Paper text:
We identified an expressed CHAD domain–containing protein in the plant R. communis L. (RcCHAD), which represents the only CHAD domain currently known in plants. We selected CHAD domain–containing proteins belonging to the three kingdoms of life: archaea (Sulfolobus solfataricus; termed SsCHAD hereafter), bacteria (Chlorobium tepidum; CtCHAD), and eukaryota (Ricinus communis or castor bean; RcCHAD). We, thus, used the moderate anomalous signal present in the native RcCHAD dataset to locate a single Zn2+ ion. The structure was solved using the single-wavelength anomalous dispersion method, and the refined model revealed a Zn2+ ion tetrahedrally coordinated by His50 and His136 originating from two symmetry-related RcCHAD molecules. Although we found a Zn2+ ion coordinated by two histidine residues in our RcCHAD structure, the contributing histidines are not conserved among CHAD family proteins, and no metal ions could be located in our CtCHAD and ygiF structures. This makes it unlikely that CHAD domains are metal-binding proteins. Notably, helices α4/α5 and α10/α11 are protruding the bundle cores in the RcCHAD and CtCHAD structures, forming a small pore in the center of the domain, which we find to be absent in our ygiF structure. This rationalizes the presence of “long” (∼300 amino acids, e.g., RcCHAD and CtCHAD) and “short” (∼200 amino acids, e.g., ygiF and SsCHAD) CHAD domains. RcCHAD and SsCHAD bind polyP with a one-to-one kinetics and with a KD of 6 μM and 45 nM, respectively. We found that the fusion protein specifically localized to the nucleus and nucleolus of hypocotyl and root cells.
Here, we report that bacterial, archaeal, and eukaryotic conserved histidine α-helical (CHAD) domains are specific polyP-binding modules. All CHAD domains fold into two 4-helix bundles with up-down-up-down topology. Analysis of the surface charge distribution in the different CHAD domains revealed a highly basic central cavity, which is surrounded by two basic surface patches on each side. The basic amino acids contributing to these surface patches are highly conserved among different CHAD proteins.
Numbering used by the authors: 7 to 111, 117 to 289, 292 to 294, 296 to 303
Write the structure that this text describes.
């Protein structure tokens, strides 16, 4: 309520088992979602919604790496996708209003800003209703119950599991950054998600790896995510405004002006792959300690 909740720092023991790490990682993800509930329902704060959306993304990536040892039931995965879409739609409209539209310097953009704010507030109300619905509360309860049941069934230490995942994710990131080509949406998106997956996994198994080696690895990853995410916000804005033009034909002139400005920003300032390649060419897989 009122205050935004950021993901709690998870410091796992070096000698900790997989049966101890799995409920600690997923529990941290569920807490990150739960502690933002009230503020997303009652308020309109963008950071509280941002933190809840990130929490859902962190949970989905955690279930993806744990999929081999503990596969999540398909019914829960459908509800996680529903929750991600509901909070995601509200987040997309908030990014457009606070970050994508203000960087646009023809005079009819004031009424467009009022229309976008109206949609963003309505999407926040729609997200609030999704959280108050029994579908959400049942999902959080069923996920927690499944987490605790599957936890003692896992074999080996956390260090043995993390090294296999970290080797695959570093291999996946470097491969996608090399296969990456200019003006290709599919390759740029694959690199951005490999950057997110790698950042989350290293934050989950934080107390298992070297303090100064991971800090430099996370810095190079966060910089790559910031660059590819900047170009991604521009293409999402163009998609959201084109959808708004079809539903609201009255503000179409103001929409097309904003769409024209953003389409040019995509061509004039594309995702600087050369700076990304130079930022990731030196990176070595973080070693256990
Ligand atoms: Zn309201």
């Amino acid at each position: 309520g009122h205050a935004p909740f950021r993901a709690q720092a998870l410091a796992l023991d070096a000698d900790a088992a997989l049966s101890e790490a799995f409920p600690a990682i997923l529990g941290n993800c569920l807490e990150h979602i739960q502690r933002n509930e009230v503020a997303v329902i009652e308020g309109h704060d963008p950071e509280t919604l941002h933190q809840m959306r990130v929490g859902v993304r962190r949970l989905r990536s955690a279930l993806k790496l744990f999929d081999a040892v503990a596969p999540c039931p398909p019914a829960l995965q459908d509800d996680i996708s529903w929750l991600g879409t509901e909070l995601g739609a509200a987040r997309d409209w908030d990014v457009l209003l606070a970050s994508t539209l203000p960087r646009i310097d023809a005079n009819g953009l004031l009424e467009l800003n009022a229309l976008v704010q109206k949609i963003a507030q309505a999407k926040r109300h729609a997200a609030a209703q999704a959280l108050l619905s029994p579908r959400y509360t049942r999902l959080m309860l069923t996920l927690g119950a499944w987490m605790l049941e599957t936890a003692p069934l896992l074999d080996g230490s956390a260090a043995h599991f993390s090294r296999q995942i970290m080797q695959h994710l570093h291999k996946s990131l470097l491969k996608r950054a090399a296969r990456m080509q200019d003006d290709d949406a599919a390759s740029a998106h694959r690199t951005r998600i490999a950057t997110k997956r790698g950042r989350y996994a290293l934050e989950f198994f934080h107390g298992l790896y070297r303090s100064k080696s991971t800090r430099a690895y996370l810095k190079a990853l966060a910089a790559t995510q910031e660059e590819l995410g900047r170009h991604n916000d521009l293409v999402v804005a163009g998609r959201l405004l084109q959808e708004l033009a079809q539903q609201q034909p009255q503000a179409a002139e103001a929409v097309q002006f904003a769409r024209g400005y953003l389409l040019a920003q995509q061509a004039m300032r594309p995702a600087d792959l050369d700076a990304i390649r130079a930022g990731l060419h030196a990176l070595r897989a973080p070693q256990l300690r």
